[PDB]
């Protein structure tokens, strides 16, 4: 897994690959690692990917009930609060590595949480397995007082540095741009440099090929009338 | 020792061109020892259907746990459950054993019968959603599966030609696999009317 | 880590260096070590940082409670809040923290906490991992009642040497001044702190 | 102290009474009669709903009959939503013994074990009983078809044909009248409109303020289904009986 | 000290009537009027904004409240009751079905949950039942439009259209006169200002009149773009110059 | 009616009879004072001998809380000492937690919330006592008083008991004839006068005079008890005063 | 009779407990008024101080709840200063929490919630209190909103609070008239002060000395009491024009 | 205990269970009862960790034992079956769980067949023809699969467990002093009292 | 009168009736005298029987070899309180290796009886108590009331008719305060003291219970024939 974050002049961008893997196997290969905690607070997650989705759905729906109980748009700072006493909570044994990044009525936020609870501020970030590949791209390029188009392009290139180098990574780069006042955009398959080529040989068989002993219709109707 | 694979089975499911279609062995073991040869491992829900693989006791306790759950949904919400909804069901109640997990890899199979579109998803056993277009394959013969499904499948197949992909898939990854076989079957999936087949195998 | 917190004439202040470890991969080389508890009662974490996060959330928490119902709290009960959380956990808790405040009848005070969760008031503390180098010359150079520009001098010198012989520390060198006129920033980059 | 305040919901009258069963007993009396009658071939159940409006959303529309599973449904007469609360109880514990077993909860056992949480709120606890009497129609491979009702004092007693709510006396002398053992269910049907029509506190008996449901096994083969009826096919069953 | 109030304060008097539940539908009645009305394409819901001082801001004061995106209510009776019921209708919308099934309760079964609650506070020990009744419209997929009431005896009702509070039994008058199952939503709310004017006595414009539908889905409202499945909530509450713009043709 | 029969049931006047009878077990009590002086404050009480029988000086009522605090009440004595016990509890959590000592005001507010509890339910009963109490901190000297009711304030003088109109004009001429303070030898000397001028109420058996003190200069900002010729020369400068 | 003991429905539909804890707000005599600047938000209240033998700094119904949140309270001391532990311990909760400081109209719900379940569960009575809570909120900016007996609270323009609210209601209410806007048009508070001094001075028809007054003011990011001496200043500038 | 067989014939269920009990070095039993009839149609034998097996076995007769009477009704093997699964399934993530392997041989009176079902620790059920735990299936299964039909008489299906007893009496190294043989069928439980 | 059905309730003039009744339990109970000197401390119980056939119940109570009690009132209820006194004695002497003292178990004794006044359900103590001991201050002598309210005195009586002797005791202070190492004269002033409150009946051999502790004395009690001497 690879996923970044990258502040520029009116907010922040947050990507991330696309390949979910069983030890060497790749399980999905169009994995989608960008989450929603509220419409303009999003975060990207690495590490056990249940426990990544999980979190980030509880805290999100206690965000949603705080943002009706205070008729207020949703904090980043409450995010991020809210994750870390859960997982300090819980030791590390809940395995979720998260940037967090959004924009409210504050400014525009971007932070990373480490599983056992410790968090930490930054200009850009990066987490997981191609996280070196991807941090040495944002150190070789980032600049104070990025443009939106630049930050994409930083970011995305960062993603492509995991993409190509780290074996935990792959297929995919999605994007989600965070501007104030704005619409959040969340670009999905932002970039698609991995698209299988044709086979060389067509395997639909023949129909007759598969022996069968038995067939029956299965009944998915409920109990009929009459 | 490892809950997993001790007693052995697979499944796998595809989509098809207005259809979806689930297969499943049928095999039950103790290791070495081959026990049953019709543990069938796909159950259904109303017109979702769902295979379990993984260790036999908690295949078994999770299909009497989710026909308990579908049975009280529908007569709460005077509907049978959705092949999107059931599968955030499985998602939220295996996650709910976080700390203590059943030793399952479930596969979801449906078509949706308001918008008639095909649906599949798998899960580990601590409930991450795998939502794939082509594929998903589960049980101690995956990495195999893998490598049939992704040089014998193609989109848009028939549902009578997507009867033999399937069933060619499992059945060359089953013969690889000392944990999966002794039978098979086969369920092809239309919006109003499913066919289940057995299919002949090899039986060692 | 390095960090230390030193008393002098005016009051006290704290020091830090600016890098998280993850083993040998440097995770933050831009940390802010140096944390605020309340106004004029600041510290510096070192140990586990999801630990030291945690512990100052809550001290904060308390003394913030504590301000409501009582008025400004001293820099002795801000330790003693410190103590009570470390010493209590001691088990489950990886924290060394160096607590320092500015009061106006006690003026500045430095209280330190082990990992035992012991507390020693001290005119000027040393800690984390870059500590053990500059025990010497901390103990050779410290003056009580220095001025303030000695006593950056002191905590930019110290640090310097902490940082160049231990691979956990490094980048650069934050400090927090706590007067009678207020709170005070100040930040030393590489190019100044290494030809020292 | 709070003493003061307490109502003493489970004690004795002088004449061994429960109190508050007998007056929970008097306020279901004023509930819309509910109606069962058991044939060979089925089971009816037929109710009237209370005084309703023309702007009430009728299909979508439920205060009488509810489902418990596949086998077994009850009709309400007494306070909604005391029933609701058992009605989701008695839902979970058919779904408790068909876990436990792999087998359809019989009806008496659902039945005995509603009837049991009613009587606890008799002796224990100091609250207020359930308002609420039912009328279970049913089908297991044991007895067949089965009528059962209960009441707020947790008692349950079988029946070839019943009714509670409103004017139970009368309309239990209209069907002890006309009731015969080797009836069916269409003959079942007609009895059960036919003595809401003559019981009902309305000028006329409409589709709008009823609601009707069969229990048959004229499901195709040896299977047992389940009918709510829908607004229009009560406006033509009754059309069919000739009652509009 | 503990809560020694064990036993239930509802109890049944010899006529077989639950007092407190009667007099607490008593307090419903004393209530500002609230009414819905359900068309083909729509569900509107409406109620007077009785400010207590012209020095109070009214706006802070919110008497229609969003429950889910596509789930609003109103009530009529006492407000602070209705305050906290919608705090633990929002919360039960989450804990008891969107943290289970990943999508937001039908109208019907948050409706269910909520009579559950005002069921209990007439039956648990040491306390009263709740003094309001509720109107909760709605939308969701399989469903379309629907509209319900709930009363402080947890019992729940389906309408077309209807009304709760002061002036109801004149109200429910005016709406079946006007009532069809032609409606569209612009003529429901036409409808529900005709009615709503009858049992309003001093200032009526969009500053005293509270006013939300259930509607179209709106996806300016939704914060973000980029998934086709999310087109926004359906619930939407009217804006002061929205209403009075409708009053011009009334 | 029945308003009076229940603990925390307001009356139509938004009243609570139960604590108002509460005062009336406090105004049954015998007399005790409290005076703040310059650098600390004076407690005093007025002990009824009922017999020869009763051991002198041994059955003591003023109460040290920490080592700082001095409490004395008027009232039901056992619903007082639950009340110090109480104290005792409070002011070691949080000297527990916060180190320092607790300030007096801080822990004015501790009674007075635990106090106005039992005022919140049907279950309990009101204290029938009010409590005078105070001493030194880090913002100097402190004196409270506390009802019933949960009510506090802050006072130059405090009297309660059965002869509380005698005491506070007592004090009242103290607190004009010293706007500049009180000495705390003196306010010892004053507070033995006051507790003799206020034993008119209670005439009909003789008394013991107790008296204790916290002082910055006197006592280290220390709570004692005045004991031998000190007691003995304010008992003195009281029976010149009534002759 | 039993209906008027504990929080149960009255064959009115009424709640006698909570009407009656509504009377006892008044048992202080002592009336309160609250109004908003551009940038601040004031709040002034009578002292009395009938005995010579009191303590007059220890006297006071305003609190700071936190840094930002200040709350004035008409009813009896001990219900007053039992609700203000709650308030500061709720405030203190929700930025450890949530990350952020307490909104002032967020503690008012919280705090009307509170009140709401005494008038629902009957082991627990009311509290004979009115909570007005003061702030300049980082959001909606100078801010006033007060709670109840009953749970019920609102956001104010101005407000008044004790047994003459009434006369300074009409009061304030004919100057919006005139005005036609939501607050004070002033830059500074200390004029601010000297408006709400000055309308509550021709509302009840008395004069005051700097130790009839008890004045709080909250700006951004603080809220803090006026000493005897700077309401002294305030009072001289009012004579002076 | 040791080894434990079942089979499923055309009017019948037959259970076969080893006689001896050793703890560690010495035979202490060679007469023992490894089984307990749950309802007259109805019988479970059982083998796992000693002290566990009879408590687990004599639990579960009580509470089938309760059943019969609270309904006057003999639930269904299968029913039965589901029954002993479902607590097996809840004891082994229980704080100590029951090391207990069952079959559990029944007539169904309703549809006038015989059922043999296989339960282990874990709470794996399946139903058989034929089945066993242990190490006792790696001996017999290749004879039953050979000589096995669906409509064997009584006597057949005795004659082919011998077979399977005396396999296993050559082949196994432990001395497990023979079996105790009792059939389920139509009229009840009943012991073969000569093996 | 309305406010006498528990003990939460106050009157209109600030009384607490339950506690008052529970005192009157006391007054129904049988006289005992307490007095001490500067070397001992004496108990003296006039026992009461039920019939001729029955026992004399006894009054007095060992908590410790230092302390113990004489009761008058609720029999059942000196056996929980004393049962306190003996586990409080005994957590003092594990834990500090330290002979409590008699003026602190007064204070233990008020707070246990205060907790029972001011709470629903309960029920106030229906038991006086006379506590005697020897401890590092000399000897003394205490009086517990179930109203929480204890005690330090000379010397005292509880129960029916303990007038008498109370007057007797006032009388005499300063000559029973003097009979310092001589338990036989202490005893015989407590005998004569609890004489005073006599009628009809006269002290018998199975009549009179005496207990006596000093400084080389650990808490006794005298039964039987024992008290012949000083009938
Ligand atoms: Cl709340
Ligand atoms: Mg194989
Ligand atoms: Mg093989
Ligand atoms: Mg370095
Ligand atoms: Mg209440």
Excluded at chain 5, 109 to 132: C, D, H, N
Excluded at chain 9, 35 to 61: C, F, G, M, P
Aim: with cysteine.
């Amino acid at each position: 897994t690879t996923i970044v974050g990258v502040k520029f002049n009116n907010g922040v961008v947050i990507a991330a690959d696309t390949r979910s893997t069983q030890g060497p196997i790749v399980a999905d290969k169009n994995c989608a690692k960008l989450h929603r905690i509220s419409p303009k607070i999003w975060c990207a997650g690495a590490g056990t990917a249940a426990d990544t989705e999980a979190v980030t759905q509880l805290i999100g729906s206690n965000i949603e009930l705080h943002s009706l109980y205070t008729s207020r748009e949703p904090r980043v700072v409450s995010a991020l609060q809210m994750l870390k006493q859960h997982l300090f909570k819980y030791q590390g044994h809940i395995g979720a590595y998260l940037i967090v990044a959004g924009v409210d009525p504050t400014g525009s936020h971007l932070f990373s949480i480490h599983a056992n609870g410790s968090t930490d501020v930054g200009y850009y970030l990066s987490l997981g397995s191609g996280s070196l590949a991807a941090m040495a791209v944002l150190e070789s390029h980032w600049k104070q007082d990025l443009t939106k188009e630049e930050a994409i392009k930083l970011a995305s290139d960062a993603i492509q540095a995991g993409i190509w180098n780290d074996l935990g990574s792959g297929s995919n780069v999605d994007v989600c741009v965070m501007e104030i006042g704005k619409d959040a955009e969340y670009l999905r398959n932002y970039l698609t440099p991995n698209v299988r080529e044709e086979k060389q040989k067509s395997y639909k068989f023949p129909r007759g090929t598969t022996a069968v002993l038995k067939e029956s219709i299965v009944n998915i109707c409920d109990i009929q009338e009459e | 020792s490892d809950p997993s694979s001790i007693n052995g089975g697979i499944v796998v499911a595809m989509t098809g061109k207005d259809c979806v279609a689930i297969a499943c062995d049928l095999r039950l073991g103790s290791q070495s020892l081959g026990v049953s040869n019709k543990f069938e491992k796909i159950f259904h829900y109303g017109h979702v259907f769902l295979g379990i693989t993984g260790l036999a006791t908690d295949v078994t306790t999770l299909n009497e746990m989710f026909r308990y759950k579908t049975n009280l949904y529908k007569l709460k919400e005077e509907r049978a459950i959705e092949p999107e909804t059931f599968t955030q069901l499985v998602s939220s109640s295996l996650y709910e054993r976080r700390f203590g997990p059943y030793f399952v890899g479930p596969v979801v199979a449906g078509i949706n019968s308001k918008s008639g579109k095909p649906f599949i998803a798998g899960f580990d056993l601590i409930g991450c959603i795998d939502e794939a277009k082509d594929f998903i394959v589960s049980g101690t013969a995956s990495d195999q599966l893998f490598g049939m499904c992704e040089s014998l499948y193609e989109p848009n197949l028939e549902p009578e030609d997507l009867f033999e992909t399937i069933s060619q898939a499992l059945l060359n990854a089953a013969d690889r696999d000392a944990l999966s076989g002794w039978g098979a079957v086969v369920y092809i999936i239309k919006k109003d009317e499913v066919v289940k087949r057995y299919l002949k195998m090899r039986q060692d | 880590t390095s960090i230390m917190a030193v008393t002098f004439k005016d009051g006290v202040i704290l020091g830090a260096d600016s890098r998280t470890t993850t083993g040998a991969y440097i995770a933050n080389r831009v940390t802010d070590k140096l944390t605020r508890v309340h106004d004029k009662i600041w510290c510096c974490r070192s140990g586990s940082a999801a630990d030291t996060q945690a512990i100052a959330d809550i001290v904060q928490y308390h003394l913030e409670l504590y301000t409501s119902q009582y008025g400004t709290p001293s820099t002795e009960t801000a330790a003693s809040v410190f103590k009570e959380l470390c010493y209590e956990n001691k088990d489950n808790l990886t924290a060394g923290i160096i607590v320092a405040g500015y009061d106006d009848k006690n003026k500045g005070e430095v209280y330190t906490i082990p990992l035992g969760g012991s507390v020693h008031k001290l005119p000027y503390a040393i800690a984390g991992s870059g500590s053990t180098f500059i025990y010497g010359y901390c103990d050779k150079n410290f003056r009580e009642n220095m001025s303030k520009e000695e006593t950056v001098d002191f905590i930019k010198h110290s640090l310097s040497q902490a940082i160049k012989w231990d691979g956990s520390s490094g980048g650069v060198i934050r400090m927090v001044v706590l007067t009678a006129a207020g709170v005070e920033r100040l930040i030393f980059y590489p190019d100044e702190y290494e030809q020292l | 102290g709070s003493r003061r305040y307490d109502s003493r919901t489970t004690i004795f009258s002088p004449e061994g009474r429960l109190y508050q069963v007998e007056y929970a007993l008097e306020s279901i009396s004023h509930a819309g009669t509910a109606i069962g009658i058991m044939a060979s071939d089925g089971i009816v159940l037929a109710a009237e709903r209370k005084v309703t409006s023309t702007l009430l959303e009728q299909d979508t529309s439920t205060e009488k009959l509810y489902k418990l599973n596949d086998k077994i449904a009850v009709a309400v007469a007494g306070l909604t939503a005391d029933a609701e609360i058992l009605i989701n109880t008695a839902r979970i514990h058919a779904q408790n013994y068909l876990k436990t077993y792999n087998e359809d909860i019989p009806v008496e056992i659902l039945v005995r074990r509603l009837s049991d949480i009613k009587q606890g709120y008799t002796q224990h606890g100091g609250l207020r009983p359930f308002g609420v009497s039912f009328i279970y129609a049913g089908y297991d491979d044991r007895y067949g078809y089965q009528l059962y009702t209960s009441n707020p004092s947790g008692n349950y007693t079988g029946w070839k044909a019943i009714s509670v709510g409103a004017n139970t006396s009368a309309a239990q002398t209209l069907l002890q009248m006309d009731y015969k053992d080797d009836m069916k269910v269409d003959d079942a049907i007609e009895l059960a409109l036919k003595t809401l029509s003559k019981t009902t506190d309305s000028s006329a008996l409409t589709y709008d303020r009823l609601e009707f449901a069969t229990i048959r096994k004229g499901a195709n083969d040896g299977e047992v289904y389940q009918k709510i009826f829908k607004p229009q096919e009560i406006k033509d069953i009754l059309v069919k009986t000739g009652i509009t | 000290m503990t809560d020694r109030y064990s036993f239930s304060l509802t109890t049944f008097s010899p006529s077989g009537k639950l007092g407190q539940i009667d007099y607490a539908l008593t307090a419903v009645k004393q209530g500002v009027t609230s009414l819905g009305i359900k068309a083909t394409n729509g569900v509107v819901i409406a109620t007077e904004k009785k400010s207590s001082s012209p020095l109070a801001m009214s706006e802070t004061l919110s008497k229609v409240s969003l429950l889910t995106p596509d789930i609003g209510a109103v009530y009529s009776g006492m407000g602070p009751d209705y305050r906290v019921l919608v705090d633990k209708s929002r919360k039960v919308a989450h804990t008891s079905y969107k943290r289970i099934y990943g999508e937001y309760p039908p109208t019907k079964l948050l409706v269910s949950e909520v009579a559950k609650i005002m069921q209990e506070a007439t039956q648990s020990g040491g306390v009263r039942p709740f003094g309001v009744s509720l109107l909760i419209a709605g939308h969701d997929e399989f469903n379309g439009f629907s509209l319900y009431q709930v009363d402080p005896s947890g019992s729940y009702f389906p309408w077309k259209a209807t009304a709760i509070g002061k002036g109801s039994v004149a109200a429910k008058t005016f709406l079946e006169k006007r009532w069809n199952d032609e409606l569209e939503l612009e003529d429901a709310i036409h409808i529900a200002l005709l009615t709503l004017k009858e049992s309003v006595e001093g200032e009526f414009n969009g500053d005293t009149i509270e006013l939300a539908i259930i509607g179209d889905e709106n996806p300016d409202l939704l914060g973000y773009t980029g998934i086709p499945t999310d087109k926004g909530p359906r619930f939407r509450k009217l804006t002061s110059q929205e209403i009075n713009d409708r009053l011009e043709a009334l | 009616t029945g308003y009076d029969l229940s603990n925390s049931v307001f009356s139509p006047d938004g009243r609570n009879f139960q604590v108002e009878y509460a005062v009336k077990a406090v105004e049954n009590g015998t007399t005790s004072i409290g005076i703040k002086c310059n650098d600390g404050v004076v407690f005093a009480v007025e002990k009824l001998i009922t017999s020869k029988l009763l051991v002198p000086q041994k059955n003591v009522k003023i109460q040290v809380v920490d080592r700082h605090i001095g409490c004395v009440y008027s009232g039901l004595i056992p619903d007082g000492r639950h009340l110090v016990n109480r104290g005792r509890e409070e002011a070691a959590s949080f000297k527990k937690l916060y180190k320092t000592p607790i300030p007096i005001p801080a822990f004015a507010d501790r009674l007075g919330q635990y106090v106005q509890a039992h005022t919140l339910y049907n279950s309990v009963r009101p204290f029938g006592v009010s409590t005078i109490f105070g001493g030194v901190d880090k913002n100097g000297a402190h004196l409270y008083m506390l009802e019933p009711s949960g009510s506090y304030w802050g006072y130059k003088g405090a009297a309660t008991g059965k002869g509380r109109q005698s005491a506070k004009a007592e004090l009242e001429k103290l607190v004009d004839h010293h706007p500049e303070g009180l000495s705390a030898r003196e306010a010892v000397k004053q507070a033995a006068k006051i507790i003799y001028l206020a034993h008119e109420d209670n005439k009909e058996k003789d008394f013991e005079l107790e008296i204790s003190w916290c002082s910055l200069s006197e006592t280290n900002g220390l709570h004692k008890f005045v004991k031998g010729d000190l007691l003995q020369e304010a008992i003195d400068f009281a029976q010149k005063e009534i002759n | 009779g039993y209906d008027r003991h504990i929080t149960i429905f009255s064959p009115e539909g009424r709640l006698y407990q909570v009407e009656y804890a509504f009377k006892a707000t008044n048992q202080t005599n002592i009336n309160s008024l609250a109004v908003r600047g551009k940038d601040c938000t004031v709040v002034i209240s009578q002292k009395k101080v009938p005995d010579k033998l009191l303590d007059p700094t220890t006297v006071s119904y305003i609190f700071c709840i936190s840094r930002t949140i200040g709350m004035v309270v008409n009813g009896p001391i001990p219900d007053a200063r039992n609700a203000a532990l709650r308030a500061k311990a709720e405030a203190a909760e929700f930025r450890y929490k949530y990350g952020y400081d307490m909104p002032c109209d967020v503690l008012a719900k919280r705090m009307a919630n509170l009140s709401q379940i005494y008038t629902q569960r009957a082991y627990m009575r009311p509290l004979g209190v009115i909570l007005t809570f003061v702030s300049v909120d980082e959001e909606l900016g100078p801010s006033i909103y007060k709670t109840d007996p009953a749970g019920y609270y609102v956001g104010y323009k101005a407000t008044a609070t004790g047994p003459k609210q009434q006369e300074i209601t009409t009061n304030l209410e004919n100057h919006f008239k005139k005005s036609k806007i939501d607050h004070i048009n002033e830059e500074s508070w200390e004029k601010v002060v000297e408006f709400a001094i000055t309308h509550m001075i021709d509302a009840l028809g008395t004069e005051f000395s700097k130790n009839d007054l008890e004045v709080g003011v909250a700006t951004k990011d603080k809220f803090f009491t006026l000493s005897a001496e700077n309401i002294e200043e305030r009072l001289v500038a009012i004579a002076e024009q | 205990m040791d080894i434990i067989l079942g089979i499923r014939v055309q009017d019948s269920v037959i259970l076969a269970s080893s006689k001896a009990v050793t703890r560690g070095i010495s035979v202490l039993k060679d007469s023992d009862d490894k089984t307990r009839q749950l309802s007259p149609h109805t019988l479970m034998s059982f083998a796992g960790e000693a002290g566990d097996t009879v408590q687990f076995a004599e639990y579960i007769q009580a509470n089938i034992q309760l059943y019969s009477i609270r309904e006057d009704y003999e639930l269904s093997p299968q029913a039965v079956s589901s029954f002993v699964r479902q607590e097996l399934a809840k004891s082994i993530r229980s704080r100590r769980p029951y090391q207990v392997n069952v079959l559990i041989g029944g007539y169904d009176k309703k549809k006038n067949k015989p059922e043999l079902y296989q339960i282990d620790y874990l709470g794996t059920k399946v139903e058989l023809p034929y089945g066993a735990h242990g190490y006792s299936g790696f001996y017999t299964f290749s004879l039953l699969d050979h000589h096995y039909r669906p409509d064997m008489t009584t006597e057949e299906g005795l004659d082919l467990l011998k077979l399977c007893v005396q396999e296993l009496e050559k082949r196994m190294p432990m001395d497990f002093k023979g079996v105790i043989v009792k059939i389920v069928d139509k009229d009840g439980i009943r012991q073969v009292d000569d093996f | 009168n309305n406010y006498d059905g528990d003990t939460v309730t106050f009157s209109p003039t600030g009384r607490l009736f339950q506690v008052e009744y529970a005192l009157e339990a006391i007054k129904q109970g049988s006289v005992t005298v307490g007095l001490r000197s500067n070397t001992h401390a004496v108990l003296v119980a006039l026992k009461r029987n039920a019939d001729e056939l029955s026992s004399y119940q006894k009054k007095i109570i060992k908590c410790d070899e230092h302390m113990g009690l004489s009761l008058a009132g609720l029999a059942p209820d000196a056996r929980v309180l004393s049962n306190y006194l003996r586990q409080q004695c005994n957590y003092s002497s594990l834990v500090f290796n330290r002979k409590l003292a008699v003026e602190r178990a007064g204070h233990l004794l008020c707070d246990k009886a205060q907790k029972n006044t001011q709470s629903y359900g309960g029920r106030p103590y229906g038991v006086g108590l006379l506590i005697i001991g020897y401890d590092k201050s000399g000897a003394h002598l205490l009086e517990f009331q179930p109203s929480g309210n204890v005690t330090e005195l000379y010397g005292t009586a509880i129960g029916a008719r303990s007038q008498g002797a109370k007057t007797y005791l006032e009388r005499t202070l300063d000559t029973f305060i003097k009979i310092d190492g001589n338990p036989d004269e202490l005893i015989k002033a407590g005998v004569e003291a609890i004489s005073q409150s006599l009628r009809d009946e006269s002290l018998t051999v199975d009549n009179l219970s005496i207990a006596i502790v000093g400084k080389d004395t650990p808490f006794t009690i005298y039964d039987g024939e024992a008290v012949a001497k000083y009938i």
